[PDB]
Amino acid sequence: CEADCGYERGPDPSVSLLEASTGPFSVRTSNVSSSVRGFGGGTIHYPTNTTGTMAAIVVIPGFVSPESSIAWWGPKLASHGFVVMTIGTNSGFDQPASRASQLNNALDYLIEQNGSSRSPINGMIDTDRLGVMGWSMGGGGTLRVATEGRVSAAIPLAPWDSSSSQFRSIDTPTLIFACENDSTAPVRSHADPFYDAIPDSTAKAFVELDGGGHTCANGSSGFGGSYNDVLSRLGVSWMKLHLDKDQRYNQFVCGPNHESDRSISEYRGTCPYL
């Protein structure tokens, strides 16, 4: 459904809530062995004190990178009312197109586990409200999955891919995080043309972060992590807005002056959405 569908959860939000180190819920974890079919294992994060179903999200890493490179997003998102699996790839050599098939395989796995007597998330997932996230080549895999129209939200992080024309099929709400000093996936050859290739009719957002390099959109529990608040405020809201059709989180994506944030170097968007 697109409006007043009854997927909303938690309080009416504010900025202090969004930028807290955790959402209103408590986080647990369930291991996925690397023997899992379709990807190289992961960790499932879930709230403990909620009711009702919730959207599923999968987060994939980039080239020769372990799941831990993006695993900050697992707890940060689960604590706001999501089921969130951070995954590892079959091989660190996997290129965008493989990383997209593994996105879909890990979404398929999550759907299977929602029906598994042995899963801590059995009956906790609405298997129609799915989101994807990815760093670098996994950010290209995210954009590729955003062309299929199964997922209702995509957040690429420092995306890397090779062809940009394929993204004119993207009708899925996509928020691309970019890093201004990205030498690995240069903005001007990657994030920038991927955003531009998305139709203006699609709800989309380009949030370039100020001064940061290739890992600036991954979050961090210690070293780095000056971007945690833009990531938390805009990422959680984007997922709350488009996975939970929760208009109460519209005010943080459409309405503010984003470049006024010291951490935001360039914002582009298509506000208003619907």
Residue numbers in the entry: 17 to 290
Copied sentences from the primary study:
In this study, we recombinantly expressed, purified and characterized Ple628 and Ple629 as marine PET hydrolases. As predicted from the sequence homology to the lipase and cutinase families, Ple628 and Ple629 both belong to the α/β hydrolase superfamily, and the central twisted β-sheet is formed by nine mixed β-strands (β1–β9) and surrounded by eight α-helices. The catalytic triad S174/S179-D220/D225-H252/H257 was conserved among all PETase-like proteins (positions in Ple628/Ple629, respectively). Like previously described for IsPETase and PE-H, Ple628 and Ple629 form two disulfide bridges, DS1(C217-C254/C222-C259) and DS2(C288-C305/C297-C314) (positions in Ple628/Ple629, respectively).
